[PDB]
């Protein structure tokens, strides 16, 4: 807390030296729409995985499968922390997220030995849950990595079913303000390009765009 100054060496250009060395150029980056309100994997940095997003099953589908279950629509819990689970979703099986990339590599007999329930067939419907729908989304990506044709995700599984207020506790790794990053300590590039990459135009909380080239606008004046 208390507004720690950060140990990065970014700086705005002064009022004395000319603007030079335009084979790198920082400018302010402003996109069209806000993405911070959206789901975490519906944001801007995950757009390329947009076709990898699992189809959504909703609350009413989950209540209908609670009341009237199907033999091959497998409800699977993807929550990892055993200290944060307090209730049982009906007709659910426990396959925690951090083991999924190993779990689908097993045979059916090894799946039965290492989890106590049968391995789902690749044509069976699989429905995944988590606290917010984040561990279930990564698990759905791991389930779609293998050739599983029908994989669905209930976004906000436990927190809407049981009414809890929990989270999957995703870190989203951001450097500590004592950790000095790469381009300050290094002779990987020449001194002009090193000074021109480390400069920015404005405060260092917003996003910027780095230009690899620039030509002078001779047609203005």
């Amino acid at each position: 807390q208390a507004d720690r100054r950060t140990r990065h060496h970014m700086m705005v250009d002064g009022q004395i030296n000319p603007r030079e060395w335009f084979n790198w150029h920082p400018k302010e980056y402003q996109p069209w729409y806000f993405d911070r309100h959206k789901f975490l994997y519906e944001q801007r940095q995950y757009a390329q995985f947009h076709h990898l997003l699992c189809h959504q099953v909703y609350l009413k589908d989950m209540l209908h499968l609670m009341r009237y279950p199907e033999p091959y629509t497998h409800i699977i819990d993807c929550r990892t922390s055993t200290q944060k689970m307090h209730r049982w979703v009906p007709h659910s099986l426990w396959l925690p997220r951090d083991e999924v990339e190993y779990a689908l590599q097993l045979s059916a007999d090894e799946f039965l030995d290492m989890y106590g329930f049968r391995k789902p067939d690749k044509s069976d419907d699989v429905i995944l849950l988590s606290h917010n729908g984040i561990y279930s989304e990564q698990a759905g990506w791991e389930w779609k990595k293998q050739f599983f044709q029908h994989v669905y995700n209930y976004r906000g599984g436990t927190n809407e079913l049981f009414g809890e207020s929990y989270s999957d506790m995703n870190v989203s790794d951001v450097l500590s303000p004592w950790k000095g990053p790469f381009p300050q300590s290094g002779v990987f590039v020449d001194k002009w390009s090193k000074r021109k990459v480390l400069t920015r135009t404005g405060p260092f909380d917003r996003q910027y765009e780095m230009q690899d080239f620039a030509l002078p606008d001779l047609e203005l004046e």
Partner: peptide, 16 residues
């Protein structure tokens, strides 16, 4: 150990 304000599983369990 949790007390939720709203719940969707419990009113379906209570009728059954």
């Amino acid at each position: 150990k949790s007390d939720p304000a709203v719940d969707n599983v419990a009113p379906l369990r209570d009728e059954d």
